[PDB]
């Protein structure tokens with residue numbers, strides 16, 4: 001096919017070895033800041049000692065800064081707490097003598113050039129959490145279940161409430177937290193009170209009662225609330241930060257049951273609801289843009305209750321695309337993909353040249369299935385979960401199998417450049433994989449029981465590969481590290497030599513491999529979501545199309561750190577398919593027409609009794625959240641009031 005020439009020399013001077021000498025136990029790695037190059041490596045020993053290393057070169061060289069922490073012992077439970085973005089804030093938690101009045105931290109605002117020791121008034125139960133708004137604002141939970149806040153980068157701490165189960169930063173330095181009264185968080189479960197502070201503890205407002213748990217995603221604030229004189233509970237939603245609430249359109253659940261936010265974005269959430277009775281699976285619902293009304297997206301979605309693992313995956317390299325696992329009747333697992341944000345799920349098309357396996361009832365006809373958290377947890381030979389990056393358009397890389405179900409065999413690696421519509425076997429056998437330069441470079445390391453001296457790369461998005469021996473002394477591979485955001489040319493291969501064992505890291509700079517900077521000609525026009533190009537609506541997803549400029553497979557050049565994914569939207573005519581049925585409406589049959597329910601049952605009937613004025617009254621149709629369509633069809637009909645229809649059956653008092 002095609003390759004890069006004289007590459008060996010180009011990677012020769014760019015391969016940078018660093019040996020880590022003393023290392024043991026927990027090894028944490030933290031990137032600090034974007035486009036800084038700062039990496040922290042924290043190690044701990046036990047009968048012990050903590051070693052701390054720093055690199056400004058993206059891992060090409062480190063320097064032992066343990067002398068900055070006074071060679072004291074860092075507790076790994078709390079790891080390295082890194083400030084948001086380029087703040088440079090770094091906080092480590094030291095272990096203190098048993099009798100100490102309070103804990104102790106080592107903090108740096110300088111990207112760990114200098115640290116300062118600070119004795120705390122308390123003992124941290126949790127890692128310290130930075131306010132996303134202001135990186136000098138931190139909150140922590142004490143072992144006494146106190147809520148402590150620092151206005152200056154952990155220098156001074158104030159205890160704002162004395163009983164707290166859970167606490168979170170919202171937007172604008174807001175703090176949400178749950179509290180208890182009588183006794184342990186555990187005991188008062190369901191009886192918890194939900195509070196909010198917007199002043200950092202000057203004043204509070206209790207925005208919920210009978211609270212079980214809460215959580216944030218997108219614009220939504222979710223709270224689980226227990227039913228009066230009952231063992232069950234249900235979701236309530238707030239977009240006003242607790243000021244007003246509304247009951248969700250979801251079913252209630254018992255105590256063995258749970259809710260989970262699978263994904264949330266400014267438009268909506270995917271809510272997973274556990275099935276009653278230890279199924280190991282649930283149903284996924286997608287919400288409307290209020291987070292109030294829930295369409296039912298997927299049945300028998302696999303989510304384990306203990307050590308809860310779900311293969312649910314945002315495919316971040318193309319808009320609207322998500323993959324996940326479902327549990328079949330034959331008790332086997334199948335991967336499904338949605339291109340529309342959960343309006344439709346379907347099996348993943350299999351590679352043209354792939355062959356079906358034993359799991360498949362027909363040798364000619366089967367599909368592609370993806371290994372993800374679940375496979376991993378069951379200890380199938382799976383080095384990495386699925387990878388995609390938003391700056392690498394359409395690209396998805398995953399271990400998988402081709403057949404009627406996820407198979408237990410040793411998986412090859414598969415790739416897609418179109419966002420999951422079509423696939424190809426990228427490499428045979430399990431590999432660790434990473435994306436550099438927004439897809440300009442793909443890198444892979446073989447997964448082996450025995451040591452490896454070799455790395456593999458592709459500049460054509462996985463179509464052909466080349467091989468580079470980065471060391472004479474082969475190592476046992478322990479991981480890849482590369483700058484978050486997939487924009488660098490720099491990749492770190494982590495491992496240890498055969499023993500007297502020690503860790504080493506070989507960091508490779510591809511700057512010479514692609515010497516040429518990409519230019520306008522190197523990009524070609526690509527419509528995302530194309531199915532039938534003769535169709536006027538081809539590629540409309542959620543009301544609109546996007547056309548991209550993508551880097552040619554053939555063209556090899558660096559995209560650049562400043563690279564901008566450029567795309568243009570086309571606004572499609574609204575059709576009924578752009579709407580979801582509103583409360584008390586459903587799509588019977590083939591027709592996409594939303595029609596009125598004859599009567600509301602189950603949680604529909606629950607809501608209908610217990611809902612509120614806005615949602616109970618309806619147009620029968622709402623725009624799918626995030627759906628940008630213009631013109632064409634707007635359903636025309638008058639808002640009705642459904643409260644009468646539910647209460648219609650009940651005898652009412654005077």
Ligand SMILES: *[C@@H]1O[C@H](CO)[C@@H](O[C@@H]2O[C@H](CO)[C@@H](O[C@@H]3O[C@H](CO[C@H]4O[C@H](CO)[C@@H](O)[C@H](O)[C@@H]4O)[C@@H](O)[C@H](O)[C@@H]3O)[C@H](O)[C@H]2NC(C)=O)[C@H](O)[C@H]1NC(C)=O
Nearest residue numbers: 262263264265266267268269270314315316317319390391
């Ligand atoms: C599945 O993965 C997709 C790819 O990552 C997700 O798409 C991304 O969604 C996020 C959030 O909706 C978008 O984030 C951007 O954030 C910046 C930050 O600016 C500020 O925005 C508001 C202020 O108005 C506030 O939240 C903060 O102050 C932020 O600092 C915005 O300026 C952007 O306009 C945009 O909102 C990404 O743009 C988007 N990526 C792509 C490639 O479209 C998708 O949401 C995921 N699905 C789910 C359900 O989570």
Ligand SMILES: *[C@@H]1O[C@H](CO)[C@@H](O[C@@H]2O[C@H](CO)[C@@H](O[C@@H]3O[C@H](CO)[C@@H](O)[C@H](O)[C@@H]3O)[C@H](O)[C@H]2NC(C)=O)[C@H](O)[C@H]1NC(C)=O
Nearest residue numbers: 037056057058059060437483487488489490509511560561
């Ligand atoms: C691969 O790793 C190397 C480090 O080994 C990274 O080197 C860094 O390169 C950037 C730009 O190429 C340098 O940035 C600087 O930016 C400021 C802002 O204008 C200005 O002083 C200069 O224009 C300068 O270029 C940075 O100093 C440099 N750092 C080191 C230690 O060499 C390189 O960025 C990595 N490659 C990629 C693609 O990320």
Ligand SMILES: Cc1cc(=O)oc2c(CN[C@@H](CC(C)C)C(=O)O)c(O)ccc12
Nearest residue numbers: 212213214215222224258259260305308
């Ligand atoms: C795996 C798992 C098991 C479980 O029992 O509960 C989970 C929950 C709890 N969800 C809360 C609702 C609230 C947080 C919005 C609730 O169920 O009341 C998760 O959020 C995520 C994962 C689990």
